[PDB]
Amino acid sequence: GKGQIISNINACVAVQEALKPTLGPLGSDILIVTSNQKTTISNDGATILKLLDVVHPAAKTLVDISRAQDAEVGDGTTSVTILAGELMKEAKPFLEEGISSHLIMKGYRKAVSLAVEKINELAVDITSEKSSGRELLERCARTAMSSKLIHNNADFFVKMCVDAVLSLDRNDLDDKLIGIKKIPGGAMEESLFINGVAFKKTFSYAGFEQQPKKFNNPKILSLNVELELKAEKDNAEVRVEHVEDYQAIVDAEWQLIFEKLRQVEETGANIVLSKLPIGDLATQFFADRNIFCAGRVSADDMNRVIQAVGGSIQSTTSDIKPEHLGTCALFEEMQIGSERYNLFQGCPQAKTCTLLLRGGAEQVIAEVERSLHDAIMIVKRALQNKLIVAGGGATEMEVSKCLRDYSKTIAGKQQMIINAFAKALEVIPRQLCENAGFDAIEILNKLRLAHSKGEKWYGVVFETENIGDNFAKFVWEPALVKINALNSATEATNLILSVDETITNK
Amino acid sequence: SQERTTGRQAQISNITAAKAVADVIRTCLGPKAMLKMLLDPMGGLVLTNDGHAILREIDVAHPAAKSMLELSRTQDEEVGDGTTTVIILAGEILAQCAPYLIEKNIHPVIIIQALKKALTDALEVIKQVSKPVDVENDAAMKKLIQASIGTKYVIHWSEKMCELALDAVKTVRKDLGQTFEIDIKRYVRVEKIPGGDVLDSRVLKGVLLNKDVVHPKMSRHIENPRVVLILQIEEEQVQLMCEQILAVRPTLVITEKGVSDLAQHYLLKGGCSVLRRVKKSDNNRIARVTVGTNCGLFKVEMIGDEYFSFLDNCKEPLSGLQKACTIMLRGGSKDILNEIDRNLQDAMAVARNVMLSPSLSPGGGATEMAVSVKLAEKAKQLEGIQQWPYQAVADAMECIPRTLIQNAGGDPIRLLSQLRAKHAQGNFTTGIDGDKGKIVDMVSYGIWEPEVIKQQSVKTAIESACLLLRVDDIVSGVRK
Amino acid sequence: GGEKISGDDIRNQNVLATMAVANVVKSSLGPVGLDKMLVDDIGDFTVTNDGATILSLLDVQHPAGKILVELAQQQDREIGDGTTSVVIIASELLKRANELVKNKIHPTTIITGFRVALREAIRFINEVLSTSVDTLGKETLINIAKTSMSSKIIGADSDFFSNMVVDALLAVKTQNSKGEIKYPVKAVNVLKAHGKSATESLLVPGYALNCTVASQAMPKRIAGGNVKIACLDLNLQKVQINIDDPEQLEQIRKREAGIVLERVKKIIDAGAQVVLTTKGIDDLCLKEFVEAKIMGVRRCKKEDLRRIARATGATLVSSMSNLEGEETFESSYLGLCDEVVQAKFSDDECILIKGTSKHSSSSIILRGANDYSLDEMERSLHDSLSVVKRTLESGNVVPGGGCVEAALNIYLDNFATTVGSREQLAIAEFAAALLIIPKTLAVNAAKDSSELVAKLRSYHAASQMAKPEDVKRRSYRNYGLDLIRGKIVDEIHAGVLEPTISKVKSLKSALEACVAILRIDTMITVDPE
Amino acid sequence: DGQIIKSIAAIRELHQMCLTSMGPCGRNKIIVNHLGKIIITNDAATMLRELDIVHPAVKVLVMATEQQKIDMGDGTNLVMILAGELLNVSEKLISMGLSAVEIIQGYNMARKFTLKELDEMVVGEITDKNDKNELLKMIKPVISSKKYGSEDILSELVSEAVSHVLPVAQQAGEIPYFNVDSIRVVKIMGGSLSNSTVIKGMVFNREPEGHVKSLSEDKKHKVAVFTCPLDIANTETKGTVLLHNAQEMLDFSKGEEKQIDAMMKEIADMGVECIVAGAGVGELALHYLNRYGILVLKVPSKFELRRLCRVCGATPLPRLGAPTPEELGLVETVKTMEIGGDRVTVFKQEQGEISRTSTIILRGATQNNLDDIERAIDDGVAAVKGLMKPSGGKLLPGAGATEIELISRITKYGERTPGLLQLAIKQFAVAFEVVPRTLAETAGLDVNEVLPNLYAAHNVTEPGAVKTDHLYKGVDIDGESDEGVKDIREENIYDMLATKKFAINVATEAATTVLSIDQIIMAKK
């Protein structure tokens, strides 16, 4: 009934206050302990909402939108839940008024429809600013380092990740091809540029020191065939009263595995790769011929051999031809924390560059993978369509006062809802000032007079504890961030007000 | 403690409070009405058709139904006449407000506005169907008492029973010369002594003193019994009272206690009959009439249980005011005497309302059908927001005769369809027959009631529904 | 005897529980509201719209809400009405005060922001204040009476009472406080009877005592002018003692009953025309009253005779006595009245005292359907006469029906920008909170709320929008409500006005009472041992 | 006793919830089953399918809505709403004791008169049923049967897909072919609602694990449907290996490897770049296809393959061999593309050859909102079935204004037929006022003022003239609804003749079914 709607709104109020430290670089971490004993600690409002566990069924609306905002932006997306949470909180007295929830939903429908028209007008083409191919993405990467826990170690990736994304082909962009491997332990400044496949460490028995770890120009060969003696052989009936014929059972496969390893070596491949684990019989054979072999190629490792390396997989040893073999300029195996990493280098045909993330904290190393992945999504949609808006949360304030201008054109009962949507939009910078310790009323009075005069883009930077322009500070944001944010948050608000009752069985 | 109801739960709980009771009293209407049985906390039972004691003994868990008993007491104190055909109207309203209340989301005050307008048009209908009759004829009131006594076999004794009360009716009256025939019949007390016959009751115009004289064989005649408003102690003190009254030379004696032997010497020398102690309330009866004078005759009678004394003024004035008297009721048996008291005691209010409004409204379900048609006629003329609620009020008066049809167990649709023509168009005397369950003339068959019966009921019934529409929240379980 | 609760729960659990109770009583606001049923657990209940009666019998387990209940006690002393309407203003004051304290600003800046706003709020009301003057006839006193008749079910019958209450208060008119018009409380006697209708009530410019004569044979009317009247408390009622001769104890009671018999005989020696006795009188002592043309009255209430000595000016005496030891009745205890006329209303006689000396008084005899009706009509006219009392005491009156709350919008909006700093946000919330009162009226009116609220803002904005010194009309001032057609109607044509005391010294006292709840930090509860 | 208490109290429990399930103002509800799966939909008929119901009388009315999905299924939630109002009118008769036989005869005599009045409500039959201009009047109000968030996008995609998903022919009579599967529902989270469009190709969710090289320019792909998995002929039972000499042991592995090589080479000889496989693919096949670069298809059981029967037009062949062109389909381009942010298999045909089927890509952020869009897609097929199956669907006043005029017609039918049922018909004649009562409750309007204004606007027929205004009159859903009664034809709000014809016919017997129950006999478990 009517009380069920208010109960669904009040259930999301505790989530809105909990997400205040999330959005913004000046926020704080939140500890989420899951059933895997791994505690999730992040300063970004996306990864937190991904693994966040809820209770009340109405909280699934914030869970469903959390998966949609991840595939669009990936960082600073808490404002989607902040807007949807505040509109429901502000509409609590409005539900008791004469305005039905439909006119409120129709008010948000007209509010987001008039907001897209404003965003299109506020969109500024960066090519008219005489920005070269470097300063365009470089200034966009520096401002993308916000919302992340560690700002100091993020400065080490500024001049690197830009060259790492540019290393990927700009005509065809793929997230799995640019995929980054995580290395536990080590300083954040210890990273490297890798052009090829990486392995966890290796699986070996007895002495591992008899195999050379560095080759000059090996031929990369990846195979899915397993090497083992009498593994999958089905039960058979063998009647032998003799000696050699009974001994030939094991000797047949021992001679066959010797022919398999010989035909593969005749192709000239110094690097042998297998999918399923293999025995130790090939050790002595590989140690004398100075040929390195590693098995258990993962799923992400196969995708890198396909595109970057450009090899082939042939199970039959007699069918392996040099056309199925790859190559490379240099093969270097680096060891970190008593763990060797097989790394392919010198691959001009490789269209991607793999990064090695070394960090001591388990909670940070999980965020850094998604931290660089967010910048990949930023450089993706921005390179195709170039649009720049001021970041830091001041983009909505330019629209906030502008929404009051459309309310003068309404002149009706729905104007109270439009004025509420414009007032409830100002909670985002107030929560950003709350994490910074700034006064709520003092800054908000300055935020209103900010866009009242100069209009355009005025950012009110929070780093210098003063008022200013984020555009002059080179603080940028992709324009598509707030486009998908306001469009998706409108459907989230329309779903909550449309449910008058919740039915639960069992 | 809370016990608070808000939203739709507040209206549903209050409507169903008196709704279940309204179906229980459907057997209390008409001369064919059943007899309800009650259960007290002591395990006993009381079998009667009077709804006053029915709602008092029955304990309803909802406090909303408790007002209906208080609303019933108001109609019993003001009228209290023929509750079989009257008091049932208290529960015929809320039951008909159920179909549209929450479903149309109409606020109760909007219904209150339609309730105030329904009372305005209802007052004009009550006096429209009423017709005047001779107010001085006592034969018209004889057949009126016989209509409400049809629940028993007393019709055979109705000749003496009707004249028993009607002799006291014309005896009192006269509280005013002009403006309205106000009276008070509470001064006349009906004593019920089991045994004997009803014909032993002596009633006439005057003041009946129920007591005995000095000796049963004393002279039974007094010329002008003028009324005036251990052994050693009784003979000296009482003599200082009765004999002291003789200074103005009355021939009638009134004392608080009996007469001793010494007082008999000086009391009997006056040449008349001496009357010993008189009942306490009998002094208040003669105090209204009258040192009183102009007393025509005295008489004393003898019968085993108690004795009688007759005192006839025969001229009140020389204006004046009402006279008071006494009535003794002698029944055939013990269980018969107590049950018939309901019809005879209510006979005082039967003729009391005749003096108030000599005009006569049609009975036997004819009044409720007349109001139901007039309310249905003014509904289409008014229209507005009152269209729906004011039309349901017309259906509320239509379900009252449906309850009378329930005693027969037939189809009310067949009867009510014919009553919308022969009654509304034909005449106001058309109604439903109680005995045969058919449509006959009410005046020709003998079913009629004074205007005060319908006037003081429907007007009170409409005003009684105000408390039902004003309910919002209920708070209990604290203190008072 | 218990634990303690601190943190944001005190700013929430105590406030939200108060809001839950406050939202209940909002259904009785305005004439379009409904009345609550109060059950006495004894089988009878009382349905009333009075806020002081409902909140008193309502069980409240939160001490924070008990302070708001005590507001009706102090409000009825200074004002005398508002429990059906005005008391609701103390509810929404905590509604918007909760959202402010849950983020940053400390309640001190919020309350001091209300203090500086309330200080100028009295002057803001004085700007829109319309004094009572230049009105034709009693239209002012009639409109104030009809406004007091609002929120009551008998408000439709007020076409009569409106003219009666005005003349009844002119009857009790006295002079006190060095030449000031005063209307003493309780001087108007309200009587109840079953019969007739509401419009059939009688206007009595004097005191009326409801009672009957001692003996039913006594004279029912005393003619003549300048009839004296007196009130007597005399009681007529029936150690080691060695009993030897019964005549000894008989002689004692003979002297006791003999002196009491003389106590009535000493009354006619002073020429008492009318005798009022607190206790009963035997029929023997009533003979002296008939020959002397005295009307005896027995079984009187102490509070009934106390109001007679105040209104008429007679001196109350306990029994027969004087400066000496002799028991007698002095003539100094006799009062004076214009005439004694016995009015019989529903078998109930009434003693009419006209031309009082000490204090001028009046009486109102109400005749109605039944008990629960008349029982509601008692509180209906109890708070109604106090509204006009403050009207003629102070000629300042303010418009009703949400006009004050709609006008203070721009007053507080421009004042919030003047002070600025951190108090601008608190002042804006205090203005938006007062707009909830007309929104509650629309809930019970079954109409659109914001449709009228947008009209309350637009039509009342033309006052400050256009320059008032340049006239130009466009502003009818009040507007503010209509309870039937759902349209914008001026209060002058509607005839609904209320004294300024209904706002000043009402919300001013309520705001100072509500800010004490925001001051509460922790809570300590000690259970009885 | 069962009808007075058990029947009325159990049905009115869910009847109050169905008041928000009908009209353009229809509201969604959250229903969690015993398994824990949350369900959000605005259709009460969809609710009753997944809802667990105990009392049998409500379960009987659930089957009435299931039959509506076979025929109409558009705005059929009135079956639960109208029956609830018919029981409310009957509840007054139950307390009076009126015979249930006269009640059954009341609906039977009214049903014969109702079906005759529906034939007088038809105006402007649309015989084209092809172009979007004529179908705009039919499709647009059907969009209002569901969420009103965007009425421009949903109405345009259905009107545009006509020439795409539906069979296109010059003149198609004799029940032209139509299928519920003619439109595939693809739910992909992310993207704006405006990004949804109609694609002539087909999209499947899977990631090729191989070396796949997409051929775009040249096109000309050969595809075939394979019943059995790709491998040498396998024994359905479990055999036993027989090993004796070294020839059987060494050539055991070489036997299965060389035969599948020649078996898969015959497929490559036909220039087959893609296949359709209902079963899995062995590991030996994918290893040899690395050299040829031939696709495999991991799609689930044939319920998905039924869509590919029209697309490719290939007959499933269990044996591999060299499939003849009869079993060889045609697809223009096969490439893995990113639509809503994920990489899936996408068949993109600029100008393709496809038989009587196509797909519609759905772009939205909320997956729960996509569930209601799937129900809205079924309304598009229901609109096609409503046009195709009967000789025509004509036009009917929409927005629930159909039965408003029918009340005045049926009220006269009771007066024109005097008798004992004259009062029974009038009670059932005004029982249709629940339709404007139901919609105005969710429209934010007060039925006290609005409902008599609807009767005052329609009157009897019109003032003196030759014309019909009442056919163009209906209740207004808009912020301007407080002004008065808005028209329909201006906004082209219409209904279908078969919508109210099949609904009232089923609701006639459904109302008498519950009233025919004397007592409900139950049992444990």
3-class secondary structure per residue, D329-365: EEECCEEEEECCCCEEEEECCCCCCCCCCEEEEEEEC
Chain B environment of C445 (Cβ under 8 Å): 107
Rounded Cα distance, A168 and A162, in Å: 10
CATH code: domain of residue B467: 1.10.560.10
List, in order, residues 6 or more apart from D20 with CB less than 8 Å away. A500, D26, D27, D29, D441, D442
Residue type present at position B66: K
B473, B474, B476, best to mutate vs chain C, most C CBs in 10 Å = B473
Q: Encode C435-455: b = buried (16+ Cβ within 10 Å), e = exposed.
A: bbbbbbbbbbbbbbbbbbbbb
d(C-alpha C212, C-alpha C319), whole Å: 22
Tokens standing for A315?
């199970």
Which of C91, C104, C435, C439 to probe by mutation at the A interface, max A CB count within 10 Å? Answer: C104
Q: How far apart are CA D97 and CA D83, in angstroms?
A: 20
* Residue of chain D whose Cα is closest to the Cα of A67: D189
For the record, the structure tokens of C503 come out as: 């706002």
Q: What are phi and psi of D79, to 5 degrees?
A: -55, -40
The helix/strand/coil state of B331 is: strand
C-alpha R_g of chain B = 27
The packing angle between helices C107-128 and C403-419, to 10°, is: 120
Q: Which residue has the tokens 């029906």?
A: C401
Among B167, B183, B346, B433, the one annotated catalytic: B346
Specify the residue for token string 């022969």. Answer: B422
CB atoms within 10 A of CB C338: 15
Q: Which two tokens stand for residue C361?
A: 């008084």
DSSP D143: H
D: neighbours with 3+ CB pairs under 8 Å? A, B, C
List Cα–Cα distances, A279 to A38, A284, C338, in angstroms: 34, 11, 131
- Verify that B1 and B125 share a domain, yes or no: yes
Nearest of B343, B446, B362 to residue B81 by alpha carbon: B343
Residue of C nearest to D449 (CA): C447
Under a CB-based contact definition with an 8 Å cutoff, are residues B471 and B117 in contact?
no
Residue B371 and residue B477 in one domain: yes
* Residue B85 and residue B149 in contact, taking contact as beta carbons nearer than 8 Å: no
Contacts of D420 in chain B (CB under 8 A): 413
Q: Which residues contact C389 (CB under 8 A, 6 or more apart)?
A: C80, C169, C183
What CATH number does the domain containing B334 carry? 3.30.260.10
Q: Are residues B375 and B327 in the same domain?
A: no
CB contact under 8 A, A312 and D211: yes
What are the Cα distances from residue C253, in Å, to C242, C265, C288, C325, D66?
Answer: 16, 18, 22, 20, 100
Interface test with D, best of A120, A174, A238, A380 (most D CBs within 10 A): A238
Query: Distance, in angstroms, between D516 CA and closest chain A CA?
Result: 30
| B6 classed as catalytic | no
Start-to-end Cα distance in chain A: 20
Of D164, D188, D210, D181, nearest to D344 (Cα)? D188
Partner-chain residue, chosen from D423, D447, D448, that has the shortest CB–CB distance to B413: D423
| Burial class (CB within 10 angstroms; exposed 0-12, middle 13-18, buried 19+) of D130 | middle
* Rg of chain C, C-alpha, whole Å: 29
Task: Please state, in angstroms and as integers, the Cα–Cα distance from residue C229 to each residue in B92, C125, C225, C271, C304, following that order.
Answer: 52, 50, 12, 10, 14
Tokens read off for A407: 């309310």
The answer to whether the beta carbons of residues C399 and C480 sit under 8 Å apart is: yes
Taking CB atoms within 8 Å and a gap of at least 24, the contacts of C313-322 are C313/C356, C313/C357, C313/C358, C313/C359, C314/C229, C314/C230, C314/C231, C316/C231, C316/C233, C317/C230, C317/C231, C317/C232, C317/C233, C317/C234, C318/C233, C318/C234, C319/C232, C319/C233, C319/C234, C319/C235, C319/C263, C320/C234, C320/C263, C320/C266
Identify whether the C-beta of residue C431 lies closer than 8 Å to the C-beta of residue C97: no
* Residue A449 CB neighbours (<10 A): 11
Task: Concatenate the DSSP letters of all residues of A422-444 into one string.
Answer: HHHTTHHHHHHHHHHT--HHHHH
Contact partners, residue C458, CB within 8 Å, separation at least 6: none
C52: Cβ contacts below 8 Å, ≥ 6 apart: C72, C73, C76, C83, C87
Asked whether the beta carbons of A344 and A196 are under 8 A apart, the reply is yes
The string of DSSP codes covering D477-514 is -STTTTT---BSTTTT-EE-HHHHHHHHHHHHHHHHHH
Q: Choose, from B83, B171, B326, B367, the residue flagged as catalytic.
A: B83
In CATH terms, the fold of domain A198-383 is: GroEL (3.50.7)
B201 and B338 fall within a common domain: yes
Q: What share of chain D is helix, strand, coil (3-state, %, to 5)?
A: 45, 10, 40
Q: Residue A476: beta bridge partners?
A: A390
Please identify among residues 432-461 of chain A the ones whose CB lies closer than 8 Å to any CB of chain C: 434, 439-442, 445
How many other C-beta atoms can be found within 10 angstroms of the C-beta atom of residue C23? 15
User: How were these coordinates obtained?
Assistant: cryo-EM
Answer yes or no: are the C-beta atoms of B358 and B133 closer than 8 Å: yes
User: How many Å apart are CA A130 and CA D452, to the nearest integer?
Assistant: 68
Rounded to the nearest 10 degrees, what angle do helices A362-384 and A158-167 cross at?
A: 50
Residues B166 and B37 in one domain: no
The CA-to-CA distance between both ends of chain B, in Å, stands at: 14
- DSSP run (H or E) holding B145: helix B139-148
Between CA C329 and CA D75 the distance in angstroms is 95
Write down the residue that tokens 């006290």 correspond to.
D448
* CATH architecture label of D1-125+394-525: Orthogonal Bundle (1.10)
∠ CA A470-A472-A475, nearest 5°, is 40
State the Rg of chain D over Cα. Answer: 29
Same domain, B121 and B140: no
Round to whole Å and give the CA distance between A192 and A280: 33
Name the pairing type of β-strands C4-5 and D358-364: unpaired
End-to-end CA distance of chain D: give it in Å, rounded: 23
Structure resolution in Å? 5.6
Q: What is the Cα–Cα distance from B479 to C250, expressed in whole angstroms?
A: 51
Query: In angstroms, what CA-CA distances link D421 with A24, D413, D416?
Result: 74, 11, 11
Of C35, C50, C76, C157, the catalytic one is C50
Nearest-CA distance from B138 to chain C in Å?
27
Task: Could you please state the CATH topology (level 3) that the domain comprising A127-194+384-388 is classified under.
Answer: GROEL; domain 2 (3.30.260)
Judge contact between C439 and C453, C-beta under 8 A.
yes
Query: D201-352 falls under which CATH superfamily?
Result: GroEL (3.50.7.10)
Residues on chain C touching D482 (C-beta within 8 angstroms): 448, 451
For residue B148, give both structure tokens: 């409400």
- The encoded tokens of residue C151 equal 């929120």
CA terminus-to-terminus distance, chain C:
8
> How many C-alpha atoms does D27 have within 13 Å on its Cβ side?
26
Where does residue D438 fall: left (phi above 0), alpha (psi -120 to 50 degrees), or beta otherwise? alpha
Yes or no: say if C363 and C439 are a contact pair by the CB < 8 Å rule.
Answer: no
CB burial of residue C85 (10 Å; 0-12, 13-18, 19+): buried
In whole angstroms, give the CA distance from residue C279 to residue C231.
Answer: 11
Helix or strand (DSSP H, E) at B10: helix B8-24
Classify the C-alpha dihedral A448-A451-A454-A460 as positive or negative: positive
Q: Chain B to chain D, count of Cβ pairs less than 8 Å apart?
A: 18
Structure tokens at B125: 């209908």
CA-CA distances (angstroms) from residue B130 to A93, B354, B394, D116, D463? 57, 12, 20, 51, 44
DSSP conformational letter for D3: I
- Helix count and strand count (H, E) for chain D: 16, 14
Residue C63 to residue C17: CA distance in whole angstroms? 11
Pair B102, B169 in one domain:
no
Cα–Cα distance for residue pair C471/C455, rounded to 1 Å: 21
Backbone φ, ψ for residue C250 (5° rounding): -70, -35
Alpha-carbon distance B288 to nearest alpha carbon in chain C (angstroms): 7
Based on the domain organization, do B333 and B459 belong to the same domain? no
What class, spelled out in words, does domain D126-200+353-393 have in CATH?
alpha beta
Which residue carries 């090996």 as its tokens? A218
Q: Domain range spanning residue B165?
A: 134-205+323-358
The sign of the torsion formed by the CA atoms of D459, D465, D470, D471 equals positive
Segments in A241-392 forming alpha helices (H): 244-266, 281-289, 299-304, 362-384
In order, the DSSP letters of D240-258 are -EE--SHHHHHHHHHHHHH
**Pairwise CA distance, residues D353 & D356, whole Å:** 10
- Specify the 3-state DSSP secondary structure of D22: coil
Task: State the DSSP string of C213-237.
Answer: BSSTTS-S---SSSB--EEE-----
Residues C201 and C164 sit within 8 Å (Cβ to Cβ): yes
Catalytic residue, candidates B27, B48, B50, B293: B50
* The one-letter amino acid at D121: M
Which is it for strands D358-364 and D183-189: parallel, antiparallel or unpaired? parallel
What distance in Å separates the CA atoms of residue B366 and residue B447, rounded to the nearest whole number?
10
Which one-letter amino acid corresponds to residue B275? L
Report phi then psi at D91, rounded to 5. Answer: -60, -35
Residue of D nearest to A57 (CA): D38
| Kind of pairing between the strands at C45-48 and C35-39 | antiparallel
Distance of alpha carbon C15 from alpha carbon C68, whole angstroms: 12
A236: which chain D residues are within 8 Å (Cβ-Cβ)? 240-243
Query: With contact defined as beta carbons under 8 Å apart, do C18 and C65 qualify?
Result: yes
**How close, in Å, is residue D164 to chain B by CA atoms?**
47
Q: Which long-range contacts (CB under 8 A, 24 or more apart) does A70-73 make?
A: A70/A46, A71/D189, A71/D190, A71/D340, A71/D341, A71/D342, A72/A480, A72/A481, A72/A484, A72/A488, A72/D190, A72/D191, A72/D341, A72/D365, A73/A46, A73/A374, A73/A377, A73/A478, A73/A480, A73/A481, A73/A484, A73/A485
Phi-psi region of D259 (alpha: psi -120 to 50; beta: other; left: phi over 0): alpha
Amino acid at A246: Y
Q: Give the tokens for residue D60.
A: 């009987």
Residue A180 and residue A355 in contact, taking contact as beta carbons nearer than 8 Å: yes
Identify whether the C-beta of residue A344 lies closer than 8 Å to the C-beta of residue A197.
yes
Q: What is the rounded CA–CA span in Å between residue C521 and residue A297?
A: 64
Under 8 Å between Cβ of B212 and B307: yes
Q: How far is D62 from B473, CA to CA, in rounded Å?
A: 38
The span from the CA of C50 to the CA of C67, in Å, is 17
- Rounded Cα gap, residues C126 and D288, in angstroms: 97
* Residue at token pair 């309204």: B22
Residues B380 and B433 in one domain: yes
Tokens of B322: 């009402």
Same domain, B392 and B347: no
Beta carbons within 8 Å of C202's beta carbon, 6+ residues apart? C343, C345, C364, C365
Do residues B343 and B417 share a domain? no
Using alpha carbons, list the distances in angstroms from residue C188 to A114, A167, A387, C170. Answer: 65, 98, 81, 11
The phi, psi pair for D197, rounded to 5°, reads -145, 180
- The verdict on A298 touching D (C-beta cutoff 8 Å) is no
Residue D29 burial by Cβ neighbours in a 10 Å radius (0-12, 13-18, 19+): buried
- Amino acid at site A329: A
Query: Shortest CA distance to C479 belongs to which of C364, C363, C369, C401?
Result: C401
Q: How far apart are CA A246 and CA C24, in angstroms?
A: 96
Catalytic residue, candidates C83, C277, C312, C391: C83
Contact residues, chain A, for C457 at CB < 8 Å: none
Q: Are residues B103 and B180 in the same domain?
A: no
Q: How far apart are CA C289 and CA C275, in angstroms?
A: 9
Residue D251: its chain A contacts at CB < 8 A? none
Q: Give the contacts of B183 (CB within 8 A, at least 6 positions apart).
A: B172, B173, B174, B175, B322, B352, B355
Nearest to C317 by CA among C307, C325, C299, C305: C305
C45 and B71 within 8 Å at the Cβ level: the answer is no
Q: What angle, rounded to 10 degrees, do the helices at B366-382 and B387-408 form?
A: 160
- Identify residue D202 by its one-letter amino acid code: M
Within chain D, all domains assigned CATH 1.10.560.10 are found at 1-125+394-525
Sign of CA dihedral D500, D503, D505, D510: negative
**Taking an 8 Å Cβ-Cβ cutoff, which residues of chain B contact chain D?**
99, 103-106, 110, 385, 387, 402, 412-413
Q: Which domains does chain C have, with CATH numbers?
A: 1-132+396-529 (1.10.560.10), 133-204+360-395 (3.30.260.10), 205-359 (no CATH)
CA distance C202 to C195: 13
Residue A115: how many other CB atoms lie within 10 Å: 22
Whether chain A has a CB inside 8 Å of the CB on D187: the answer is no
CATH 3.50.7.10 residue ranges for chain D: 201-352
Rg (CA), chain A: 30
| Tokens of residue C19, six digits | 């809001």
What are the tokens at B274? 């001496």
Closest C-alpha to A101, from A192, A14, A5, A36: A5
Which residues in chain B precede a discontinuity of more than 2.5 Å between C and N? 179, 229, 290, 318
Contact status, residue C195 vs residue C369, Cβ threshold 8 Å: no
Q: What are phi and psi of A425, to 5 degrees?
A: -75, -20
**B109 contacts C34? CB cut-off 8 A:** yes
